[PDB]
Design a protein around this motif. Structure first.
Motif, PDB file in Angstrom:
ATOM      1  N   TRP A  83      40.778 -18.541 -41.961  1.00 19.74           N
ATOM      2  CA  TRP A  83      41.478 -17.261 -41.873  1.00 19.74           C
ATOM      3  C   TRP A  83      41.473 -16.445 -40.588  1.00 19.74           C
ATOM      4  O   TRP A  83      40.547 -16.507 -39.787  1.00 19.74           O
ATOM      5  CB  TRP A  83      40.974 -16.298 -42.953  1.00 19.74           C
ATOM      6  N   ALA A  84      42.522 -15.634 -40.462  1.00 22.58           N
ATOM      7  CA  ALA A  84      42.721 -14.688 -39.369  1.00 22.58           C
ATOM      8  C   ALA A  84      42.100 -15.044 -38.028  1.00 22.58           C
ATOM      9  O   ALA A  84      41.042 -14.524 -37.659  1.00 22.58           O
ATOM     10  CB  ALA A  84      42.224 -13.316 -39.814  1.00 22.58           C
ATOM     11  N   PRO A  85      42.761 -15.918 -37.264  1.00 27.96           N
ATOM     12  CA  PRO A  85      42.216 -16.300 -35.960  1.00 27.96           C
ATOM     13  C   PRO A  85      42.452 -15.224 -34.904  1.00 27.96           C
ATOM     14  O   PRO A  85      43.246 -14.301 -35.106  1.00 27.96           O
ATOM     15  CB  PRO A  85      42.958 -17.596 -35.651  1.00 27.96           C
ATOM     16  N   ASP A  86      41.736 -15.335 -33.790  1.00 30.94           N
ATOM     17  CA  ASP A  86      41.894 -14.406 -32.678  1.00 30.94           C
ATOM     18  C   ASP A  86      41.828 -15.259 -31.432  1.00 30.94           C
ATOM     19  O   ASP A  86      40.964 -16.122 -31.322  1.00 30.94           O
ATOM     20  CB  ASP A  86      40.774 -13.366 -32.641  1.00 30.94           C
ATOM     21  N   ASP A 146      37.651 -11.875 -39.912  1.00 35.19           N
ATOM     22  CA  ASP A 146      38.580 -11.056 -39.128  1.00 35.19           C
ATOM     23  C   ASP A 146      38.088 -10.677 -37.738  1.00 35.19           C
ATOM     24  O   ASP A 146      37.992  -9.497 -37.397  1.00 35.19           O
ATOM     25  CB  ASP A 146      38.941  -9.780 -39.890  1.00 35.19           C
ATOM     26  N   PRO A 147      37.802 -11.679 -36.902  1.00 37.40           N
ATOM     27  CA  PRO A 147      37.320 -11.397 -35.552  1.00 37.40           C
ATOM     28  C   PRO A 147      38.390 -10.945 -34.566  1.00 37.40           C
ATOM     29  O   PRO A 147      39.575 -11.238 -34.726  1.00 37.40           O
ATOM     30  CB  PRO A 147      36.715 -12.730 -35.129  1.00 37.40           C
ATOM     31  N   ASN A 148      37.948 -10.206 -33.555  1.00 36.45           N
ATOM     32  CA  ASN A 148      38.813  -9.780 -32.460  1.00 36.45           C
ATOM     33  C   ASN A 148      37.917  -9.558 -31.268  1.00 36.45           C
ATOM     34  O   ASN A 148      36.903  -8.865 -31.362  1.00 36.45           O
ATOM     35  CB  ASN A 148      39.563  -8.476 -32.735  1.00 36.45           C
ATOM     36  N   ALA A 201      40.423  -6.320 -40.780  1.00 35.90           N
ATOM     37  CA  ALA A 201      41.267  -6.814 -39.695  1.00 35.90           C
ATOM     38  C   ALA A 201      41.340  -5.894 -38.473  1.00 35.90           C
ATOM     39  O   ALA A 201      42.424  -5.455 -38.080  1.00 35.90           O
ATOM     40  CB  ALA A 201      42.670  -7.081 -40.228  1.00 35.90           C
ATOM     41  N   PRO A 202      40.191  -5.615 -37.838  1.00 28.29           N
ATOM     42  CA  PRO A 202      40.156  -4.743 -36.662  1.00 28.29           C
ATOM     43  C   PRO A 202      40.727  -5.396 -35.406  1.00 28.29           C
ATOM     44  O   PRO A 202      40.628  -6.610 -35.220  1.00 28.29           O
ATOM     45  CB  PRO A 202      38.665  -4.453 -36.504  1.00 28.29           C
ATOM     46  N   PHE A 203      41.331  -4.579 -34.548  1.00 27.34           N
ATOM     47  CA  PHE A 203      41.861  -5.062 -33.286  1.00 27.34           C
ATOM     48  C   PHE A 203      41.719  -3.912 -32.299  1.00 27.34           C
ATOM     49  O   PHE A 203      42.259  -2.827 -32.514  1.00 27.34           O
ATOM     50  CB  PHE A 203      43.324  -5.491 -33.423  1.00 27.34           C
TER      51      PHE A 203
HETATM   52 CA   LIG Z   1      42.824 -10.200 -36.651  1.00 27.71          CA
END
Ligand SMILES: [Ca+2]
Length: 314
Positions: A83-86, A146-148, A201-203
């Motif tokens: 899930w949710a790549p950065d 949810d990494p960034n 989902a932080p950015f």
């Molecule tokens: Ca993200």
């Protein structure tokens, strides 16, 4: 930004009426040469490519087979969706962070894959499994997904992440390993202060001496019934406190709503923000009310007012 380079393209002059293969959940973008790339949630991390950033075509994936170490952190995982790549570019290397987890649980781990290039035609193309970055067990008060990655003004790389539980976390990364030092402090920087704590989902981006934290409020994965909303707050220091337009801290549910969706594009969420010269774009997914509520890629120019706050055009 040096770690999310786009050249001299002008996002504001481009037509963002996308076409092609647009199904995507938590998409991120990177450009290398004349090729655009989208990485998003899916089996072994799905990849899409484009010549102009408007016409997208599905390509392959990062991991044809999942690394065995995942089982050490998430033994219960039975499928291959990451899930949710950065994505970020540093020292000639592309760093792709992603999440390994199971829906509804915080037994998770963020992994790292690196490549010298994004072009499969190049002999040096090879996504290497560089292992776990940080993880959470059922005993932790946070969720490691949810990494960034963001590099502050001083060149220091930081990793933000988080979903529910205590909320959004922040931790320093070492430039050599691009992983946190074993004794690095984990700091919580945003929370709804509610239960459940619907923030994820932080950015983070830095613009004109300010760090802007974009997050997704409320609920995802429910098709046309999703209630996702994109919110934003800012701070002069990477560590906070991030506060919204009303002066409310993001640790107390603060956050200025940037997009709440509409009857055609429902629950916009999992955003990413990129710049090129004076222009910028907001990338996210939204549920297609006209196509069974499937998560769909969205790219729109993102403007900034005189006070420095971002806003979407009409
Ligand atoms: Ca993200």
């Amino acid at each position: 930004v040096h770690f999310h380079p786009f050249g001299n393209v002008n996002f504001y002059e481009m037509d963002w009426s996308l076409k092609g293969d647009l199904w995507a959940h938590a998409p991120v973008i990177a450009k290398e040469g004349s090729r655009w790339y989208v990485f998003h949630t899916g089996s072994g991390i799905q990849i899409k490519t484009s010549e102009d950033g408007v016409h997208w075509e599905n390509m392959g994936w990062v991991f044809p087979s999942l690394p065995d170490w995942y089982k050490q952190y998430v033994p219960e995982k039975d499928e291959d969706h990451l899930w949710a790549p950065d994505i970020c570019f540093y020292n000639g290397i592309y760093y792709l962070y992603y999440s390994v987890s199971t829906f509804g649980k915080n037994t998770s781990v963020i992994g790292l894959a690196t490549n010298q290039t994004l072009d499969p035609r190049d002999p040096d193309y090879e996504w290497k499994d560089m292992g776990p970055v940080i993880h959470s067990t059922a005993s932790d008060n946070y969720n490691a997904i949810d990494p960034n990655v963001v590099f502050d003004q001083e060149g220091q790389p930081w990793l933000s992440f988080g979903s529910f539980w205590s909320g959004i976390q922040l931790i320093q990364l070492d430039t050599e390993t691009m992983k946190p030092a074993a004794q690095a402090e984990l700091l919580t920087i945003a929370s709804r202060g509610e239960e459940p704590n619907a923030i994820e989902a932080p950015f983070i981006v830095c613009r004109n001496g300010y760090y802007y934290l974009f997050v997704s409020f409320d609920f995802c994965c429910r098709g046309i019934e999703s209630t996702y909303k994109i919110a934003v707050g800012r701070s002069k220091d990477i560590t906070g406190p991030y506060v919204d337009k009303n002066g409310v801290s993001m640790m107390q549910g603060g956050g200025t709503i940037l997009d709440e969706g509409n009857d055609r594009w429902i629950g916009p969420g999992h955003c990413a923000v990129y710049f090129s010269g004076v222009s910028a774009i907001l990338v996210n997914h939204a549920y297609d009310a006209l196509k069974n509520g499937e998560p769909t890629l969205q790219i729109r120019p993102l403007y900034w007012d005189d006070e420095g706050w971002p806003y979407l055009s009409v």
